[PDB]
């Protein structure tokens, strides 16, 4: 419900190292192949870090509805980013019931894409005025997550980081690494010295 957004600018990122790790085994990407986005430059990168169940993965999808999709974080159809996740029963799932995480269960309207609602208004859905109390159609709509080590993997915590990409007339602040080759002297070579090339 309070998904953190961080702007990443002016650095170099090795994207395919995360793919060649085999420990974060979700890796859902839209727009471009993981190898091509490694050798691709962008103006800004936005990271969305949050934790869901093992069954709410379908809610993190454009064109798909749901409490996570419509009341917590909405994915636009024109999405060219990446979603990464893994299993975190080691320090997020704890004995006795991990009730630390929250999610918006009710809202008077569906969230727009790239919108966050953190208001603690009592959700009125009936005729009796709430006036801040809990009761009939009068609920604090931030339902709590529940995690246990004996819970199913469909209900086990996955920490999810969502990558975002944007482009404008502003220059590409972030990009990926550029390969280097050992130089050869006294030979006919086909070189590309930085942008400049020649034979």
């Amino acid at each position: 419900y309070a998904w953190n957004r961080k702007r990443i600018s002016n650095c170099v990122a090795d994207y395919s190292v995360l793919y060649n790790s085999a420990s974060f085994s979700t890796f859902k990407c839209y727009g471009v192949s993981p190898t091509k986005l490694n050798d691709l430059c962008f103006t800004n990168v936005y990271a969305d870090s949050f934790v869901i169940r093992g069954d709410e993965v379908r809610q993190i999808a454009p064109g798909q509805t749901g409490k996570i999709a419509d009341y917590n974080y909405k994915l636009p159809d024109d999405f060219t980013g990446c979603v990464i996740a893994w299993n975190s029963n080691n320090l997020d799932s704890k004995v006795g019931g991990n009730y630390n995480y929250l999610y918006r269960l009710f809202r008077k309207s569906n969230l727009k894409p790239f919108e966050r609602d953190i208001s603690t208004e009592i959700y009125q859905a009936g005729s009796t005025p709430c006036n801040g109390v809990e009761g009939f159609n009068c609920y604090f709509p931030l339902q709590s997550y529940g995690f246990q080590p004996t819970n199913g993997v469909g209900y086990q915590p996955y920490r999810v980081v969502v990558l975002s990409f944007e482009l404008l007339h502003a220059p590409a602040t972030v990009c990926g690494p550029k390969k280097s080759t050992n130089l050869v002297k006294n030979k006919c070579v086909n070189f590309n010295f930085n942008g400049l090339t020649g034979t």
Partner: nanobody
Amino acid sequence: EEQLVESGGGLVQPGGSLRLSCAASGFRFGSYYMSWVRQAPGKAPEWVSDINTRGETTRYSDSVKGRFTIARDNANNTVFLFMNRLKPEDTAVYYCAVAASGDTFEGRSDPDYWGQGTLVTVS
């Protein structure tokens, strides 16, 4: 609507063979992917089996290949899976998944729905 019911696991000695059955409901079965994962102590779920849209093409893990011999039954909406000559480290809860990708771009599109699976113990 959509539901996965599974059976067949148990406690088998090393070197044994066993069956696992998964039946799906709520959606069309014949033209969709079906994957198998296993969860063991130590986390890190390992994706080990997949059947294609065709009823014959099968994708196996590089750790064990051809061990999870597979069938396909579009009329029964039930899949049988045999495994043979068990390692002692193969004790796991086996999950049968649903269709992945589906016109999305490549990069191991993770399946959204998985089953509750069945215990298999080897000792």
